[PDB]
Ligand binder design. Structure first.
Ligand code: ZN
Lengths: 1221, 49, 49
């Protein structure tokens, strides 16, 4: 046994080699430290967004704030932290007070519930008050494999294990990376460790898939209810002078029953801590059926029937989760006990392994005496015990896997069987990793993962794109317009990008070119070179990746004050700075704004025609935020008179003819890692710029480069504008000369930024995408193609074949396609104007040094595993919830006989929260998972996401959800529950309250036919909600109203649906009791399913169950209903005297199925219920003609089968990175 | 309804909710009413959450 | 595309050709300086001996 502590809270000869000399004369560039810290923060997963969801009690969490207000406050919070991250008092990049009017934007707040109501008063409080009105009361070294250097011979054997070579590193290792050009290895460890000694971290909230159990694979245990000790002819086995005692496989006692108790005999490494422990039927188990919606109850004891199915389902869920383990292979021992001669019994771990044999192999105990137990053992076949078949492959003298016979239960086994499969299907082999990592690198380095031959090397990481999509839709929903959630991603990335990029921004370039009313000085004072903050530039790029949830735009403040005018020198510069920077924003309306800006300043000089009799030519530019505002004369240049507005006409042509052209680039490794792309092909990454092949020799003045040309064109335009001085009277001296040169200087400035933004920038982004924690989510970039401009992105929960309440995702309340992010035009322009590479740059080397440290900390793999669960979770939910509410999801309903109301959104929600937390604590998850789906009517069918174009056409993406082990297992066990229901403490059918005094010994759980009656029986009376009672006057008997409308007297056989009693507990108790007890009234309460409790008694002594059945009736409530109490006789292996027994409660169909055996240690049962060890349960032992691998699910759970036990290897991901010449 | 001392309203609010064990003039009325017309009847849910 | 595949069970280790042939550490090879530079440690370790 080992042990992995939880991170969450649960249910609780010269050897001097010739090349090893260190000559560490290398200093990385960029520096390792620099890049690490940077990626260290990009690694971090986005924050969980509880706000809006319900807690286990059903009350939604958060503060009582208007959706609009929350959205705004969150915006401020974000922009304000943006400031603290850039060590400035005022944020340059802001998520608030952007030019955009996001007046309709909504954020999830704790102000509303799941039924569209106000949480002014908590759900729990309402439920309480609501039931409180219905209440009533009683009346008055060296490694040649990877080249890593070690120091201990042991550290070597320990190490090489990572390659498959076995002991001829600490499991704490998850990632072992190593560069070839320098001596600097990098290993990742779980963030939950206490010794981050020179180790890197794996932050991802990764689920624990692989777990082991060295114990017994059974979930049912046989217990003694009534002890007993009887005399026997044989007392023990003797050998020479030695003597061994007799150990039976089953309890030696008068009565024994089966009970559910997940992992009672398990021995694990990790504790899922989601156990389902039941107590013997003689004690109260009511607690198992009221964990859920039974919150606002009027009684401690007693559960609520309408919440039964809901509760039971959840229980079955934990029954599965708690059993999700792999069966570990432990050793054996060759046994020579006469009865199991020569068999190989598997020995459990720890001390007293031989103590368990007696329980693991029934056949071991001989057939010493004449007892029901022995009669069984005698019936079994000798040959099927111990090891049955083993693997041919083996390490050392131990087999890689083995099949063995041993106590266990078909259900649990069958479950772990599928769990196995599912994982196995997720297998990958290092060679695949080589291809993946290498391809991601875009060819700057090459990974090599050496390994030896092995088939029991489990590396679960492969999944389907579908799964990743489903998973990322959950991520998108999480944002929910809370800037706070995005703020970091964007920022933290812009940083990574900054120190992974060879581009350097040096304003002095501008300073040196100007060399200085002065146009020259103005522009300088306008640009402000001294200021070294460029967040806007970097962020701008990071934005290109999440263009579907966030939309960047230029801060309204960057436009000309009051509109501006071509007559003001200062304004002309504003125009410049603006036009030059707009193209880098994702804002689909940049162009229109770039145009209108000048059109604004032109008022009084040139005039364009407006299509609207309302909007003028002065409509501020920053207001054309959506597509419907694009002016007609902008789409059809032909409408602008070269006579009435010569300049504007050119500006228009320039935009159409020279504004950048979007493009795409391949990224990641879609064959191994899959791809979470939704609206775009799997291998594509969209760009709003044209990209070209990298080549540092490129000329600075290459008018082939879209961006460089724009710089030019915008300059020559201005020139033309300022040339004749027709647009600037009141300018006393001719500034043409100066104004011109000043522009010429800008036009021809030697910035290499455009060069970079078109060659390297694209590469860098691609080299990251795959490793990012929040994969890209883009929406096509279309330039002037208005009709195709996207304007809305939404998510759907119901299926395409249904018409439901339209509940648009908050994502759609944004004026833009996404949350508005404002950037600073100034900063961006300056950046575009003064970039340069280091003179000694050599791409091949630079990027190699940039990738190594960055990929060495990759968390791709772990995220993949999570994506897998995130899906299973969703899938499971819909499958379950759909069984307590009215959904049009096709699923086999096996528990419809267990009463349940028709869950409302609110009710369903709280249910979900449990289905939620239970999964999290089972997989040791501490972050998000389903939370976002619990923000309003989780009674869903299927996830899907889409976006619309201005022309009304829309694109709907509905991922093809595959299977779900968890989901199926729940259903499998549920199918079994439909038969073995008693084993779980539940009884099916109805009950009948009525006096029955006799001396017979039949079990009240298995009554004789003529004591039970049904609706289609003669002389019966059925009742309904209208059961008004009338008191008897002057001697006449009182009477209750039929269902037919007949008043009958208090006698005979009635049929009451439980509800009736619940509605009138007090009144009925008062009016009926006396008649039931000593009169001739017998009532059949229709229940469906119900928890039961047993009270055994001595048959030979008086016994009157009125007390219990009274108290039961007394404690029924419109909410509760305690376990039904049955009084059963103690079976006996010998003649006994009889004595009267008065009963009042009997079942209406067999329910004593949990009964395992009576007087087990004796020859036969003389009086009372006689049960013999259920041979059916031990099929492969009691039936010769049955193949070893036969199960009888789902009608019978066998308690002894063939279990396959493994022993896998779970190595860390190894990667040897090489450089390229 | 808002405000404390609310449990009272839930009974003046919906008469069809009372139990009908008696043959009292009241129960008789209640008893003869259609069951399904109580509580929320229909709604216009536009924004999820 | 040059890479190295370690040896096992006595076999010899081998480095990849330029045509995709894998040879043992012996004979006459041709390395462009750069290729070594980009892998100094790994190479010195594997070949020097
Ligand atoms: Zn190694």
């Amino acid at each position: 046994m080992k042990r992995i502590p939880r991170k969450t809270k649960g249910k609780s000869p010269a050897t001097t080699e010739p090349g090893t000399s260190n000559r560490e004369q290398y200093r990385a560039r960029p520096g390792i430290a620099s890049v690490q810290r940077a990626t260290e923060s990009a690694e971090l997963p986005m924050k969980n967004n509880d706000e809006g969801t319900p807690d286990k009690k059903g009350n939604t969490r958060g503060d009582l704030v208007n959706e609009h207000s929350e959205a705004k406050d969150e915006a401020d919070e974000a922009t304000q932290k943006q400031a603290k991250d850039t060590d400035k008092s005022k944020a340059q990049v802001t998520y608030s007070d952007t030019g955009i009017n996001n007046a309709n934007e909504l954020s999830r707040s704790g102000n509303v519930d799941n039924e569209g109501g106000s949480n002014q008063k908590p759900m729990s409080t309402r439920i309480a008050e609501a039931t409180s009105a219905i209440v009533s009361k009683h009346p008055a070294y060296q490694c040649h494999v990877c080249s890593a250097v070690l120091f201990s011979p042991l550290d070597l054997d320990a190490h090489v294990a990572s390659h498959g070579l076995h002991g001829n590193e600490i499991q704490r290792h998850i990632t072992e990376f190593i560069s070839s050009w320098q001596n600097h290895p990098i290993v990742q460890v779980s963030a939950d460790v206490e010794n981050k000694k020179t180790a890197q971290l794996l932050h991802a909230d990764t689920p624990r898939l692989v777990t082991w159990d060295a114990g017994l694979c059974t979930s049912f245990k046989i217990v003694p209810i009534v002890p007993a000790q009887v005399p026997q002819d044989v007392l023990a086995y003797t050998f020479f002078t030695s003597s061994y005692a007799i150990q039976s496989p089953f309890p030696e006692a008068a009565v024994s029953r089966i009970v559910v108790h997940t992992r009672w005999a398990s021995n694990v490494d990790f504790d899922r801590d989601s156990s389902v422990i039941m107590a013997p039927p003689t004690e109260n188990n009511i607690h198992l059926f009221k964990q859920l919606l039974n919150t606002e109850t009027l009684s401690v004891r007693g559960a609520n029937p309408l919440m039964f199915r809901a509760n039971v389902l959840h229980m079955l869920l934990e029954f599965v989760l708690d059993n999700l383990y792999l069966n570990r292979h432990t050793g054996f021992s060759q046994d020579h006990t006469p009865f199991t001669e020569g068999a190989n019994l598997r020995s459990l771990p720890g001390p007293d392994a031989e103590k368990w044999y007696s329980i693991m192999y029934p056949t071991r105990m001989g057939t010493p005496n004449v007892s029901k137990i022995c009669n069984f053992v005698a019936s079994c076949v000798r040959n099927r015990v111990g090891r049955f078949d083993r693997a041919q492959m083996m390490n050392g003298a131990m087999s890689e896997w083995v099949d063995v016979f041993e106590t266990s239960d078909a259900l649990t086994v069958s479950i772990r069987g599928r769990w196995m499969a599912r994982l196995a299907r997720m297998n990958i082999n290092p060679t695949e990793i080589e291809w993946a990592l290498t391809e991601c690198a875009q060819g700057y380095v090459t990974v090599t993962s050496p390994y030896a031959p092995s088939v029991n090397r489990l590396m679960p990481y492969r999944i389907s794109n579908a799964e990743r999509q489903i998973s990322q839709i959950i991520r998108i929903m999480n944002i929910g317009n809370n800037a706070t959630v995005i703020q970091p991603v964007l920022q933290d990335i812009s940083v990574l990008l900054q120190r992974i990029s060879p581009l350097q921004i040096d304003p002095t370039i501008i300073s040196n070119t100007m060399s200085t009313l002065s146009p020259a000085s103005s522009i300088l004072g306008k640009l402000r070179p001294s200021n070294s903050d460029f967040s806007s530039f970097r962020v701008a790029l990071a934005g290109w990746l999440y263009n579907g949830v966030v939309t960047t735009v230029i801060d309204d403040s960057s436009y000309p004050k009051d509109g501006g005018s071509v007559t003001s020198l200062e304004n002309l510069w504003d125009f410049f700075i603006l036009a030059l920077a707009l193209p880098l924003t994702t804002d689909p309306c940049a162009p229109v704004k770039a145009f209108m800006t000048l059109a604004n300043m032109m008022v009084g000089f040139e005039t364009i025609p407006m299509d609207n009799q309302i909007y003028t030519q002065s409509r501020r530019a920053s207001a054309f935020s959506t597509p419907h505002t694009w002016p007609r004369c902008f789409m059809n240049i032909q409408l602008i008179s070269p006579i009435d507005a010569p300049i504007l006409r050119q500006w228009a042509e320039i935009i159409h003819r020279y504004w950048p052209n979007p493009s795409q680039i391949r990224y990641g490794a879609p064959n191994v890692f899959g791809s979470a792309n939704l609206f775009t092909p799997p291998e594509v990454l969209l760009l709003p710029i044209d990209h070209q092949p990298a080549n540092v020799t490129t000329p600075t003045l290459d008018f082939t480069n879209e961006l460089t040309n724009w710089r030019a064109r915008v300059c020559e335009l201005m020139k033309n504008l300022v040339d004749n001085q027709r647009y600037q009277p009141g300018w006393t001296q001719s500034l043409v000369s100066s104004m011109r040169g000043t522009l010429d200087k800008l036009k021809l400035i030697k910035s290499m930024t455009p060069m970079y933004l078109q060659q390297l920038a694209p590469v860098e982004l691609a080299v990251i995408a795959p490793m990012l924690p929040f994969p890209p989510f883009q929406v096509p970039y279309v330039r002037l193609d208005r009709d195709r401009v996207p304007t809305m992105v939404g998510v759907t929960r119901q299926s395409r074949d249904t018409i439901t309440q339209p509940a648009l995702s908050l994502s759609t309340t944004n004026t833009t396609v996404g949350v508005p992010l404002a950037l600073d035009a100034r900063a961006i322009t300056v950046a575009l104007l003064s970039g340069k590479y280091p003179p000694d740059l050599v791409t091949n080397v630079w990027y190699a040094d940039a990738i190594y440290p960055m990929y060495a900390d990759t968390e791709v793999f772990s995220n993949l595993q999570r994506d897998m669960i995130t899906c299973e979770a969703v899938q499971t939910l819909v499958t379950l919830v759909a069984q307590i509410s009215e959904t049009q999801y096709p699923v086999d309903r096996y528990l419809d006989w267990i009463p349940s109301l028709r869950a409302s959104a609110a009710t369903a929600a709280t249910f979900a929260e449990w289905v939620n937390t239970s999964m999290k604590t089972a997989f040791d998850l501490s972050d998000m998972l389903l939370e976002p789906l619990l923000s309003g009517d989780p009674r869903m069918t299927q996830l899907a996401i889409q976006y619309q174009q201005y022309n009304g056409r829309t694109f709907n993406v509905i991922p093809e959800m595959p299977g779900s082990v968890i989901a199926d297992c729940v259903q499998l066990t549920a199918e079994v529950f439909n038969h073995e229901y008693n084993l779980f403490g539940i009884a099916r059918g109805d009950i009948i309250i009525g006096r029955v005094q006799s001396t017979h010994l039949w079990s009240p759980l298995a009554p004789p036919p003529d004591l039970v009656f049904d609706r289609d029986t003669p002389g019966v009376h059925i009742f309904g909600r209208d059961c008004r009672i009338s008191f008897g006057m002057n001697g006449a008997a009182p009477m209750i109203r039929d269902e037919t409308g007949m008043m009958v007297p208090f006698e005979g056989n009635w049929i009451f649906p439980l509800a009736l009693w619940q509605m009138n507990t007090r009144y009925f108790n008062q009016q009926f009791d006396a008649w039931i007890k000593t009169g001739e009234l017998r009532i059949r309460i229709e229940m469906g399913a119900y928890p039961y409790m047993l009270h055994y008694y001595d048959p030979r002594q008086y016994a009157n169950a009125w007390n219990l059945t009274s108290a039961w009736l007394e404690e029924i409530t419109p909410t509760s209903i305690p376990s039904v109490p049955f009084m059963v006789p103690i079976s006996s292996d010998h003649d006994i005297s009889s004595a009267p027994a008065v009963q009042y409660i009997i079942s209406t169909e067999y329910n004593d199925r949990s009964l395992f055996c009576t007087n087990s240690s004796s020859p036969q049962t003389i009086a009372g219920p006689d049960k013999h060890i259920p041979v059916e349960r031990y099929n492969i032992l009691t039936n010769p003609d049955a193949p070893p691998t036969q199960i009888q699910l789902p009608e019978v759970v066998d308690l002894y089968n063939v279990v396959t036990r493994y022993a896998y290897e779970t190595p860390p991901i190894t990667a040897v990175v090489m450089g390229v010449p």
